[PDB]
Design a binder for this molecule. Sequence first.
Ligand code: K
Ligand code: K
Ligand code: K
Ligand code: K
Ligand code: MG
Ligand code: MG
Ligand code: MG
Ligand code: MG
Ligand code: MG
Ligand code: MG
Ligand code: MG
Ligand code: MG
Ligand code: MG
Ligand code: MG
Ligand code: MG
Ligand code: MG
Ligand code: MG
Ligand code: MG
Ligand code: MG
Ligand code: MG
Ligand code: MG
Ligand code: MG
Ligand code: MG
Ligand code: MG
Ligand code: MG
Ligand code: MG
Ligand code: MG
Ligand code: MG
Ligand code: MG
Lengths: 181, 336, 394, 238, 46, 124, 102
Amino acid sequence: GLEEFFDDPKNWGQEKVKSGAAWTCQQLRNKSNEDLHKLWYVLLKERNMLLTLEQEAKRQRLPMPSPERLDKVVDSMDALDKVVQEREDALRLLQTGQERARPGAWRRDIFGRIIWHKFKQWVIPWHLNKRYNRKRFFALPYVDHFLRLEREKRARIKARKENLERKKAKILLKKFPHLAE
Amino acid sequence: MKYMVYPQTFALNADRWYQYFTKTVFLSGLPPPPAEPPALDLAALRAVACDCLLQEHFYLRRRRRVHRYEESEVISLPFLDQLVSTLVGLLSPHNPALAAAALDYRCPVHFYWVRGEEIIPRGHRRGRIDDLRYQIDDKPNNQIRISKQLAEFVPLDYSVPIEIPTIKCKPDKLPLFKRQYENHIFVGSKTADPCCYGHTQFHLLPDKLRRERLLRQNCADQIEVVFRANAIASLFAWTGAQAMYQGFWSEADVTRPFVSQAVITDGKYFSFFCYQLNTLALTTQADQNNPRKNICWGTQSKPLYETIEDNDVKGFNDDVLLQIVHFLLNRPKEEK
Amino acid sequence: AYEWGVRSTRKSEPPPLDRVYEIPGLEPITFAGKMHFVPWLARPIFPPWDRGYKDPRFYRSPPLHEHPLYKDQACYIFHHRCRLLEGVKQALWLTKTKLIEGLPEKVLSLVDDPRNHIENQDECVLNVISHARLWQTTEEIPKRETYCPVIVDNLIQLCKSQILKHPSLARRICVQNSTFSATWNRESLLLQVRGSGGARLSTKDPLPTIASREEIEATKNHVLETFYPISPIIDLHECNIYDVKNDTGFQEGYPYPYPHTLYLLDKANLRPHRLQPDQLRAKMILFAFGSALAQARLLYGNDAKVLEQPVVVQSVGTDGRVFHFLVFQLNTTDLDCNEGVKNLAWVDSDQLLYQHFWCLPVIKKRVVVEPVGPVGFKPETFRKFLALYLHGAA
Amino acid sequence: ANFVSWKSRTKYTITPVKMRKSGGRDHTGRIRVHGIGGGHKQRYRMIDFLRFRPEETKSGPFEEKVIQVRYDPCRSADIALVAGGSRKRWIIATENMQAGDTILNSNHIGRMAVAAREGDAHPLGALPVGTLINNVESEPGRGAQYIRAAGTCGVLLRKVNGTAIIQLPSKRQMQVLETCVATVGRVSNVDHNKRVIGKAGRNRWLGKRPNSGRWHRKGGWAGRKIRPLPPMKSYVKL
Amino acid sequence: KARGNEYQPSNIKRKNKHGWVRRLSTPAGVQVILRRMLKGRKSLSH
Amino acid sequence: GADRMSKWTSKRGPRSFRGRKGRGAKGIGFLTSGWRFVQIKEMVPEFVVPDLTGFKLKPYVSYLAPESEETPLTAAQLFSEAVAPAIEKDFKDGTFDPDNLEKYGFEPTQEGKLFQLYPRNFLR
Amino acid sequence: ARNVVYPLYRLGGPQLRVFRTNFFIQLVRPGVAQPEDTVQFRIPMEMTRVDLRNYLEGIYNVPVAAVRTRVQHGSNKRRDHRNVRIKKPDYKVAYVQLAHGQ
RNA sequence: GCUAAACCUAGCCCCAAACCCACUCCACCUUACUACCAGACAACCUUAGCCAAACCAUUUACCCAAAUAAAGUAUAGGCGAUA
RNA sequence: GCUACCUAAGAACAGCUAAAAGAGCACACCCGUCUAUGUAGCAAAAUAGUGGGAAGAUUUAUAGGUAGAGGCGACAAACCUA
RNA sequence: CUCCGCAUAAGCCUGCGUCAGAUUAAAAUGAACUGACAAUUAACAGCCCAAUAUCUACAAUCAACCAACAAGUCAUUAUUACCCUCACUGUCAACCCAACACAGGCAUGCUCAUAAGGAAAGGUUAAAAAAAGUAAAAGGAACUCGGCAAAUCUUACCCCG
Ligand SMILES: [K+]
Ligand SMILES: [K+]
Ligand SMILES: [K+]
Ligand SMILES: [K+]
Ligand SMILES: [Mg+2]
Ligand SMILES: [Mg+2]
Ligand SMILES: [Mg+2]
Ligand SMILES: [Mg+2]
Ligand SMILES: [Mg+2]
Ligand SMILES: [Mg+2]
Ligand SMILES: [Mg+2]
Ligand SMILES: [Mg+2]
Ligand SMILES: [Mg+2]
Ligand SMILES: [Mg+2]
Ligand SMILES: [Mg+2]
Ligand SMILES: [Mg+2]
Ligand SMILES: [Mg+2]
Ligand SMILES: [Mg+2]
Ligand SMILES: [Mg+2]
Ligand SMILES: [Mg+2]
Ligand SMILES: [Mg+2]
Ligand SMILES: [Mg+2]
Ligand SMILES: [Mg+2]
Ligand SMILES: [Mg+2]
Ligand SMILES: [Mg+2]
Ligand SMILES: [Mg+2]
Ligand SMILES: [Mg+2]
Ligand SMILES: [Mg+2]
Ligand SMILES: [Mg+2]
């Protein structure tokens, strides 16, 4: 019911609520998928009670009792999502050998820069699609000059960064001259 | 800017909200029968109701396929339009009033009234007194207008020991939305039309408010609410428009009650209502000392037939058909 | 001669193929493997693609000739939207009938006495006109698509108020949204009528016959008029995908199978979209003929001969201000030939119920010249409307 | 520019078609003809200039009945609605044409000439010399491209080796074959050239814009020039 | 008369005249976006 | 005078613009004639929620636990745990061939499956 | 779910199911007076009223009669010390009405 | 006595060396950053002029694959400017 | 997105006279004749009054088109983002 | 006082709601400035449509007399295919274009004088000059380039077009 969005009535008004540690990714690699699918919803309901309390503390202009509780649950929800995705990725390499779950390809855009194109789901082949064929995946010769100008811009930045670091180190010996070794 | 009040509404518990907008108290059952001082052949009327019912479902041949969402506007609408046309011709010998009566198909009914006040919360008009205006734009499937006025059900000073619901929030939470457009007070015809008094309305609920869609949305307790919410709004807007035609309004409240009837159905189930307009002064300046309130009687929704298979109507109920006749039989009291 | 459609609007010729497709034993390098167009590679040739599964929103019907119900012999279909050119003269040839100006004496005798008239007839009909055109809606001036049906339904409701005198009027209803079909031949021409729209006054008892046996045998001397060079099938839908079939509109067992009167309305605001007087009388004749022919075949089989009990069907066509009356009698189902017994038809033309209606007071130089209300109201027109309704019940 | 022509319909019909104006602009969007813009909206009524067009299932001479002669806002002449068989079409009406007349459309070239009635369509080799004609065509089946305007009329001068000598409204002679179909009589609205515009505004209703106010000096092109009638134009290949 | 109010905003006109789709429509508009990408513009187009 | 450095949203533009732009919500149907929307029950995501009765695990873990090291799972780690034991047994039995690889657990293709691995056709 | 690709559907295909949903909702106190049955939530933009119903009935076993949603604009008026506008995140609000008179 | 004054870091410049070149998920050529439907539009082509010649009209240096030297030489050029 | 002209599909014009009107009186609306004021102003062309037109070659909202060796122009060398 | 006002479209995008304030308006109660909190809930509106062939001569104007030209904004059928249905988005304000909290510019509906919306005077004194008005003895254009302006409600003629 709607009583699961709030904390134990007795805890209302308290400034501290003791809480345990956050689930670690290694402690979840021992549980089964059915147990992880059940735990996801146990943490989900605890996360919504903490988001509801965090918003009502701002409404009443008071500090949240134990903000770390929300950080712990978020870390546990991310660790659990890492384990499941890890098992699915490994299972995909064995049956298929693919490293990515979503298809894609390397292509040049109209601007001439390399980009990874993530495919979409369609009902008709690509040679019949009106909107897909209006999109261009090739750069014309009027782009070469801008590609060089953009490459030279990155080189200037990288040169100032490297020369600056050398300066700091040369100025770092004037005050600490025992760093010669 | 005025609130748009839809009689056929999807809002939860709208009947309780509409009672406050109209200062109306709802009572179960039908009005007290008047204990005051021809041959009605039921067998003939039963055959008709089953003939018009079987016609639209089975006998009539459709050119194109009929879809579920088209049923109300292709099967139930003609049947309701046809059931009324034939019943008024079979009851005219029993009620002369139906002879010289005006029968309308999908004619609009409009009523515009003011109830309550508010303090403008924001804007350059903040903190100023504004009136809460309402408008009902209703189009019943059918309605019967007559030249002479029906008799009251109870006296005008009559009062019940029941309080009218009161809301704690503003109507915007029903939900109810505002708009500014032409204000109309229309009984179904212009003032010049002598037939300015209402007899009985017939409404058909749309497919969006169908019973089976309300059980999917965990709104089983709202089935009857949709029935009596349409009556309270449709009958208050009709009786109120009849009084305006006679010259009455908030300051000059009605001297005699204005009554009317309504049959609310979804094609299979039928509900019957009666409304009496005791008061028309609903503004704060006039409702301050007003003792009296408007009344509405209503029955529970009951099916006319259990099932229709081929050319046989299964579980036909005669009690529902007899109640439709009593409404059509009612006539204005005659003078000495 | 002059062809229609400029080449600039037509679909441009597909681009010429690359010359690598002309060299045998050489596979062209295309951008099909790149999944996108590039200018420096050959354009591939994709094979015809098929969805492989059904999708109603993206359905493509098969070619016409492949349709099952396809016949080389065309069938000229007459529907509500057909506007004949020669009007009645062309409908009298398609139906093989004889026209008789004026309604039958019997029908007119029904309302000849002052006993069947309605209480305050003149005053009650005037209120149906004013209501339909003045009081019906909120708008100042109602449209014709709005008052034409109302002024007819109310006139029927007013004529249905005489059940007190004639209890035999409770054996009839007014059906809506009904259709009917009827197929026949006229000098090696497959004809079909598909009636739709309007109201069908249905009854339990069939209408009696009007003409006697001697009046039906006297039609063998009448000759159908011709309108050369114009063909009798002009302004009809020449269809090649059809199905010869007969239908009354209702299944077997309907309590009200016998059609009494057909009410056709020209409810269209624009004048070009409204039928002309002669065109509306032809639609009335063909629809009445299609409803009477649909009963004959059901009752007397699908043969072709002279009927022993002719079928009688009435019809009333109105534009909201003008009314046309028809009494059609089916005397035979053998129409392929132009000789022999012929059908009958009594028609009244251009019967004005009222000349004009002023919805607003006409003020000229601060003087009310014409007040609101009907102008030139004729009660005789309604007596004929009431006679048709009382035929077979009084 | 994104200009698309309105002349896209590919099937003939007598229904008035809605057309859009140009304003004197081409597909590029630049003005190519000055003095064109605005005017009352108009609906185009397709005109069949091939009088002898037997129906799909019919061949040989046929007859049509005139239904209605009406005003056409797209031309100076009046148009007539004729119906033959199961079809209907618009044609150019003649000086004397009424609702109820029966016109003839034939391609038969008899040994002897035929009595010529106005509105009828016969070949050039089937009409006597001196007969007024209109809506002639260059070659058979080409369609009538000449003498279409109001009141205009030609005349048949002589016949030579299956060739007819036609005199155009510009008093110029044109030579074509005797199998080319022409219509007898003058074109309708004989008094069109006698109309008075009356006011400048009435030319703005016809889609005509005022002339430029810039003053131009005349050159040698101006002035009366008496030059001889050009030679006869022949569409017959020998 | 008084000037200065030449800008009558219209989102339709703004997206059709100087929008992203119209820039890429011509090679000169693609060079416009490339110059603004080289300079570091936070907005490349409307 | 327009803000070209502000997020373009459905709240901006005329009526036709504001109705065509959305907020990221996935569709659950299509529009038919008459502007009538048709909802597809198969397009609405169905929440598969399990029974949480008698479930030991809780949102948090007690601090009195060991600091076990992290060993990210790999494909080779999953093969040796589940697939290898069955192969070793059949190898010792003397009945092992590539044709039976499908019996061991290998999937030759992904078609004809409800939950394909590549391209995956299911939600997290 | 949000920030994920939805498998495309065709006529006769399987039912779409999400086993782990990343939608996280927070119940809030209404700023203005509301009916007793009404409840107010703050939900992500990608979430629909149909999902909120099935989300509440399934996870929390709460019967709901009606659900209404609105998008609330977040002020982009605030500016920092560099005179750059700061955007308050736009959020979606949901109004839920209980079913059985609760 | 107010207003102010004063500061040394941020980083930057010129060389040398070395070729250079991404990523959580989701979204983005339609009104970019918008889950989902029948398409076939496609790229290439002498720079000119300011200026100098005290106007201007032929003409007037512009990295083009090794520093130096041969040499401002041969040669070109309103045989002028200059190249 | 101003303005000049054009295209598509829209909107507005009381009352009086005459009822025929590129007709008259005269609101809304469009224009800007004369006068005063204002001249770093309310305004980088305005204010008040007085005036011209106001069912037409009228005014006007929306989207689109014509681009500088050019466009558009009832030619003022007009207008094409003060 | 009422130059209006309410609403829609367009445009703008939280821009006088609550709490707090050292910020602010001529003004150390108010606030359009700052910080936090809250808020606009669909029925109105937007977002639509299976294919192929085929059909569509007869304006509008109270549309009936009548009279027109500049000749007009609204229509189908045949066969095939097609049983799940109420999602998504706009909804605030004292607001937009003119550098301004600008005497300017700004489409439509209703109201046609208001039931709505507003305040010309910071206080005093009552010089000149200046601005906007009212009244004026007798005379009545003698003013002036000119009856400009004001008042009043008028004749005739010429040039140009
Ligand atoms: K010089
Ligand atoms: K704003
Ligand atoms: K100003
Ligand atoms: K006030
Ligand atoms: Mg003409
Ligand atoms: Mg023309
Ligand atoms: Mg000229
Ligand atoms: Mg000139
Ligand atoms: Mg909404
Ligand atoms: Mg020089
Ligand atoms: Mg503009
Ligand atoms: Mg135009
Ligand atoms: Mg006027
Ligand atoms: Mg005038
Ligand atoms: Mg005038
Ligand atoms: Mg001009
Ligand atoms: Mg000049
Ligand atoms: Mg000059
Ligand atoms: Mg709607
Ligand atoms: Mg509002
Ligand atoms: Mg003041
Ligand atoms: Mg002062
Ligand atoms: Mg002074
Ligand atoms: Mg004086
Ligand atoms: Mg003097
Ligand atoms: Mg004088
Ligand atoms: Mg003097
Ligand atoms: Mg003066
Ligand atoms: Mg002049």
